[PDB]
Amino acid sequence: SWEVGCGAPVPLVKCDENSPYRTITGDCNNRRSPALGAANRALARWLPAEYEDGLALPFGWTQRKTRNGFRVPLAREVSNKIVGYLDEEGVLDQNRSLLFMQWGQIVDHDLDFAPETELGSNEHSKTQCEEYCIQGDNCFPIMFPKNDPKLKTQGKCMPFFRAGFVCPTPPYQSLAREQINAVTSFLDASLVYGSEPSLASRLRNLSSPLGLMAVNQEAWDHGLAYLPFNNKKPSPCEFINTTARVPCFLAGDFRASEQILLATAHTLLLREHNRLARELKKLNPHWNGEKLYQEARKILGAFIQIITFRDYLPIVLGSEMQKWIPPYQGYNNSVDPRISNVFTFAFRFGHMEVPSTVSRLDENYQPWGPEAELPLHTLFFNTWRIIKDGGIDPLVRGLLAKKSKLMNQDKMVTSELRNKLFQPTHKIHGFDLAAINLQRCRDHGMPGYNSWRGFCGLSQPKTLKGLQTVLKNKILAKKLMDLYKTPDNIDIWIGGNAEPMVERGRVGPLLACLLGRQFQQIRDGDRFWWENPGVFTEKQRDSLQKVSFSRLICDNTHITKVPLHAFQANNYPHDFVDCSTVDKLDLSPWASREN
């Protein structure tokens, strides 16, 4: 029944068998099926795609075509009715540092990307979608409902383009449309080094034979590195301030400069890599360039896996952590490590942890200057506030001392992102991340909220009352039921995020199920997982077991006052200890006597 498979726009797969390092494309991780968990392959489908025409059109494309008997609500109306809120007071998460939100976006980025289809450069098609809001082909305009304030100041719609899809990049009509995952499903640091050989090398500094990742030669941070700029025009980091004229950064992942704190976390990672490569050279001066890069790359990948799985995942999953992520039992080659399509949506829960402002803090963690605190939207693709305004050291203090937004049923997504998002090649701070998310669900042909509840062994509410009992919220149930006239139709994104938080965790039962499963697969089906016997030496594993985000800060910034548990709420100077009382990553176990 299920064919051997389509694979036109994907090259050859030739796997070096002795190779002890990962490939940049992620290819060859799994021996029996070497394309599993590799960039540029279709996202996996845990459940059949659901499309309007059961092939490729998204629901809500043909006004006359209903879903389960009903019309799907406009993405922006749902957003306006449910997602939006005015009052930023009392919305901070008392037990999560803002670093909690940041680590989430870092991991999400390392895992999946599903970029839009290409048909817009040297073609004005991109402007024809924007200008006349005509739905066609890839252009899938997010229309404004009747009472929208944006109707008055912005037009009839918000531009939107369908995500790219495997095999043909013009419409094919036999198997359902499968979108592409442009990065490697492995927690490999793809976001630091690249997912394409072509990027991966450019990012490198091949001049010196020291295995360094190339840095910015135009500007520094107290003698500390900055990612190289990307000299591709037009640049949104230039468009936001045309007087400053500072371009976006060049990183392993394309979206690195979308907001200043991600740009910031990317800055810390590159530094650790360089810091590692210099430390290794000293111990093993005989090591060639490649070895230094690979060994360094290998370590940072382990670092991300420990932080994410030991410190991050448990505070996201809490009570459900063990249920889906039992302690490691070793590599299983029968585990599918490909990121599933719906996970790329489950993981957007992070969007409700983004608060309306960002601050810069001095050495006693106090307001750094006149405008230490800034509105989040002035930070989208803002690179000049880092180079021209104090380095990352101030911003990394805000990441430790401020809180993330708490998910709230009456306050889901802050307007900075809801009304004011900036998208490249478009001119305004006037977009909606919520609306986009919803439209993306439909574009990916996502099954409704009950299919996913079914998928997780949870009940499937069919009535208003049924929904209320699940969400533990009358008014929220009433609104959803008014917009989608049946739970069966609630877009997974808004659906999963409406459930209350499970104990000790920051997501509901449905997302804990979907997230947990994926991460469990990420770990168990990855031949190069740091704790998988034989990847690192038992001694090395003991060295690694001691890493901490605090340590990464201390090593890569001039901050000497960090908390111990980076992800929880920590105030200064009480919960802050000197860096010396914090374990280091002793790299001695990497000495290589070959005499």
Ligand X SMILES: *[C@@H]1O[C@H](CO)[C@@H](O)[C@H](O)[C@H]1NC(C)=O
Ligand Y SMILES: O=C(O)/C=C/c1ccc(O)cc1
Ligand Z SMILES: *[C@@H]1O[C@H](CO)[C@@H](O[C@@H]2O[C@H](CO)[C@@H](O)[C@H](O)[C@H]2NC(C)=O)[C@H](O)[C@H]1NC(C)=O
Residue numbering of the annotated binding site for Ca(2+): 110, 184, 186, 188, 190
If contact means CB under 5 to 8 A according to the sort of partner, which of ligand Y, Ca ion, ligand X, none does residue 567 touch? Answer: ligand X
Say whether residue 110 binds Ca ion (CB under 5 A).
Answer: yes
User: How far apart are the C-alpha atoms of 569 and 401, rounded to whole Å?
Assistant: 7
Q: Which residue is nearest to ligand X (CB)?
A: 208
Q: Mask of contacts with ligand X, 554-593, x by CB under 6 A?
A: -----------x-xx-------------------------
Closer residue to ligand Z in complex, CB, 241/284: 241
> Residue 335 or 501: which CB sits closer to ligand X?
335
Tell me the C-alpha distance between 486 and 68, whole Å: 8
Report the C-alpha gap between 272 and 552 in whole angstroms. 7
Which residue in this structure is represented by tokens 């009715």? 81
- 198 contacts: CB under 8 Å, gap ≥ 6: none
Which span sits near ligand X by CB under 6 A: 169-177, 327-335, 471-479, 584-592? 327-335
Asked if 458 interacts with ligand X (CB under 6 A), we say no
Q: Does 245 sit near ligand Z (CB under 6 A)? A: no
Residue type, 313: L
Out of 109, 266, 273, 444, which one is annotated catalytic? 109
Q: Which of 168, 141, 160, 139 is nearest to 42 (CA)?
A: 168
The tally of CA atoms less than 13 A away on the side-chain side of residue 358 is 25
DSSP string, 114-181: -PBPS--SSSTHHHHHHHH---BTTB--EE--TT-HHHHHH-SEE--BPBPBSS-SS---SS---BEE
Site string for ligand Z, 188-227 (x = CB under 6 A): ----------------------------------------
Piece of the chain touching ligand Z by CB under 6 A; list 139-147, 171-179, 238-246, 286-294: 238-246
Query: Residues in the site for ligand Y, rule: CB under 6 A?
Result: 254-255, 257-258, 424
Helix (H) or strand (E) holding 480: helix 474-483
Judge contact between 171 and 444, C-beta under 8 A: no
Q: Which of 310, 388, 462, 546 binds ligand Z (CB under 6 A)?
A: 388
210 binds ligand X (CB under 6 A): yes
Contacting positions for ligand HEM (CB under 6 A): 101, 104-105, 108, 112-114, 258-259, 344, 347-348, 350-351, 353-354, 417, 433, 436, 440
**Residue whose Cβ sits closest to ligand HEM:** 350
Opening angle at CA 380, ends 378 and 383, nearest 5: 90
245-282 burial code (b ≥16 CB/10 A, e <16)? ebbbbbbbbbbbbbbbbbbbbbbbbbbbbbbbbebbbe
d(CA 156, CA 150): 8
Nearer to ligand HEM, 101 or 189 (CB): 101
**What residue numbers does the annotated binding site cover?**
108, 110, 184, 186, 188, 190, 258, 351
Is 67 in a helix, a strand, or coil? Answer: strand
CB of 421 to ligand X, least distance (A): 29
Site for ligand Z contains 384 (CB under 6 A): yes
Query: Residue 338: which of 508, 118, 178 has the closest Cα?
Result: 178
Q: Which of residues 247-276 bind Ca ion (CB under 5 A)?
A: none
Of 37 and 159, the one with the shorter C-beta distance to Ca ion is: 37
Question: Do 27 and 13 form a contact (C-beta atoms < 8 A)?
Answer: yes
Residue 545 has phi, psi (to 5 degrees) of -50, -15
Q: Choose the contact partner of 77 out of ligand Y, ligand X, Ca ion, none; CB within 5 to 8 A by kind.
A: none
Selection from 199, 203, 226 nearest residue 213 by Cα: 203
Smallest distance from ligand Z to CB 388, Å: 4
Choices 26-34, 329-337, 371-379, 575-583 (CB under 6 A): range interacting with ligand X: 329-337
Q: From the CB of 352, what's the least distance to ligand Z, in Å? A: 27
Nearer to ligand Z, 94 or 243 (CB): 243
Decide: is 315 part of the binding site for ligand X (CB under 6 A).
yes
For ligand X, the binding residue among 66, 154, 319, 332 (CB under 6 A) is 332
Q: Tokens 């749902």 belong to which residue? A: 78
Virtual CA dihedral for 34, 39, 42, 44, nearest 10 degrees? Answer: 70
Are the beta carbons of 161 and 116 closer than 8 angstroms? yes
Measure the CA–CA gap between 272 and 585, rounded to whole angstroms. Answer: 11
Tell me: does residue 112 bind Ca ion (CB under 5 A).
Answer: no
Under rule CB under 6 A, residue 243 binds ligand Z: yes
Stretch that binds ligand X, among 7-15, 63-71, 209-217, 544-552 (CB under 6 A): 209-217
What is the nearest approach in angstroms of ligand X to the Cβ of residue 242? 26
Size of the site for ligand X (CB under 6 A): 17
**Which of the ranges 168-176, 205-213, 240-248, 352-360 carries the binding residues for ligand Z, by CB under 6 A?**
240-248
Least distance to ligand Y, CB of residue 245, Å? 18
Instruction: Determine phi and psi for 93, rounding to 5 degrees.
Output: -75, 110
Cα–chain-centroid distance for residue 501? Answer: 21
Active-site annotation holds for 222: no
Binding stretches for ligand X (CB under 6 A): 95, 205, 207-208, 210, 212, 214-215, 217, 315, 329, 332, 334-335, 565, 567-568
Binding stretches for ligand Z (CB under 6 A): 241, 243-244, 384, 388
Catalytic residues: 109
